[PDB]
Design a protein around this ligand. Structure first.
Ligand SMILES: O=C(O)[C@H]1CN[C@H](O)[C@@H](O)[C@H]1O
Length: 459
């Protein structure tokens, strides 16, 4: 009904980046490692949610709580630890001290085996010692093994140590570089092959750029963070603003691309979500987050990112997966945007140009030549008030199907489906609605409701 009529032109000759198979990922608080039941081979529910997000992917463990977690080689989990549900750190005050045990690391290894995911593991540079980091790294490497361990990170958001009471106001990149080298040196004595990434901050000029320049021979990739919300001085983030382009993201991405050109280091977005402080109720925990997250995954893949890790845990407002081993796990709305990406699969991005779209400017579209040879198109109609009718040219196929990413309202906290079905227990998901996209004159026409997504697959 009264859609904006737009054109989408796919160009199979306009080659973009190849999405790596381990692009997807999640980030969790290191405090969660206090509970050996969470990242465990026994946590079949959570493992299933990860496998549905990707047969390959990366689990990053870090966050603010990584400055408050203290590995101890003799420790055993307490009764309290065995029930801990560590949600995103809200950033209001110091996290609780937690202990990480051998048992938790042993169980993490088995969780990585059950999921097939690789690991980015934070070490406690904020408050811990080099020697303990070396010992923790040694045990992780011993246990998890080089093939599954992608990187250690030496501190989380070190540019914010002072804001969070971890370093004095004078702490700057030069001070952090000294800490980093002390930790690096200690760890490499115990773990000569230890891989690193950093600086595990948002892009900025005073930390990330000089980090890359100084440590490019010592790290495997650059790790960056991104939250769509800006500083606390901004108007409170809304769904409307979450759907819009974020010029800061665009600039930071360009910055990362220049770092890669200068240093050779690829970049991964190792911690991201919509809003700070564990998210914003009525924004982060809504269907709009699915549109935002799915679109972000493709925007960053098209920009040459190696991958992404959406922060979460517990029942945090922005978590993709919520729950506990005792109570079970569920897919929150954001998960469904990641599910659309998962179902599209890997391949090479292609040119996909929108026209006649000024009245529906928040529609995005990405075309992909899948590794199976089939063309897919992921569309995010992020316009909150405009339906669209998309005239698709540049695809020659006898049959196109669509899987829709839907909820009845953008701010819904539930009622989210993909392919006509919710995700069930343990990540199980099957499409239940089959819809063909009408074809005529070598073109296709796709209707999309306001605030919806679609994944098209062409035979
Ligand atoms: O929700 C947030 O604000 C995020 C910011 N980044 C930190 O590394 C996380 O621990 C968490 O506090």
């Amino acid at each position: 009904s009264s859609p904006v009529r737009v054109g989408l032109s796919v160009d199979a000759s306009a080659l973009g980046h190849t999405i790596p198979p381990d692009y997807t990922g999640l980030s969790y608080e290191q405090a969660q490692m206090a509970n050996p039941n969470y990242f465990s081979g026994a946590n079949t529910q959570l493992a299933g949610f990860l496998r549905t997000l990707g047969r390959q992917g990366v689990l990053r463990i870090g966050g603010n709580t990584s400055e408050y977690t203290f590995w101890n080689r003799h420790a055993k989990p307490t009764a309290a630890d065995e029930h801990l549900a560590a949600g995103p750190d809200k950033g209001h005050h110091a996290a609780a001290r937690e202990v990480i045990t051998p048992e938790a690391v042993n169980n993490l290894s088995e969780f990585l085996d059950k999921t097939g995911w690789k690991l980015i593991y934070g070490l406690n540079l904020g408050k811990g010692t080099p020697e303990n980091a070396a010992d923790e790294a040694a045990y992780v490497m011993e246990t998890i093994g080089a093939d599954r361990l992608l990187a250690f990170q030496l501190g989380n958001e070190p540019d914010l140590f002072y804001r969070n009471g971890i370093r004095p106001a004078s702490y700057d990149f030069a001070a952090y570089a000294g800490d980093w080298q002390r930790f690096f040196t200690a760890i490499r004595k115990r773990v000569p092959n230890a891989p690193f990434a950093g600086p595990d901050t948002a892009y900025n000029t005073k930390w990330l750029v000089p980090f890359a320049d100084k440590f490019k021979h010592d790290v495997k990739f650059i790790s960056s963070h991104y939250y769509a919300e800006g500083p606390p001085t901004d108007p409170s983030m809304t769904i409307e603003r979450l759907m819009k382009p974020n010029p800061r993201l665009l600039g930071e991405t360009a910055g990362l691309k220049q770092v890669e050109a200068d240093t050779g280091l690829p970049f991964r977005l190792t911690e991201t979500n919509s809003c700070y402080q564990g998210g914003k109720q009525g924004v982060s925990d809504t269907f709009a987050a699915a549109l935002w997250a799915g679109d972000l995954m493709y925007q960053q893949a098209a920009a040459g990112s190696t991958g992404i890790n959406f922060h979460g845990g517990g029942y945090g407002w922005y978590t993709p997966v919520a729950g506990t081993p005792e109570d079970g796990f569920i897919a929150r709305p954001e998960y469904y945007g990641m599910l659309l990406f998962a179902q599209a699969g890997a391949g090479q991005l292609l040119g996909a140009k929108l026209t006649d779209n000024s009245a529906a400017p928040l529609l995005t579209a990405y075309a992909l030549r899948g590794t199976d040879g089939r063309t897919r198109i992921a569309l995010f109609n992020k316009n909150l008030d405009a339906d669209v009718e998309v005239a698709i040219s540049g695809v020659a196929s006898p049959s196109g199907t669509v899987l829709r990413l839907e909820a009845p309202r953008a701010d819904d906290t539930t009622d989210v489906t993909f392919g006509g079905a919710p995700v069930g227990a343990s990540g199980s998901w099957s499409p239940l609605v089959q819809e063909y996209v009408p074809g005529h004159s070598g073109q296709f026409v796709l209707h999309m409701r306001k605030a919806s997504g679609a994944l098209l697959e062409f035979a």
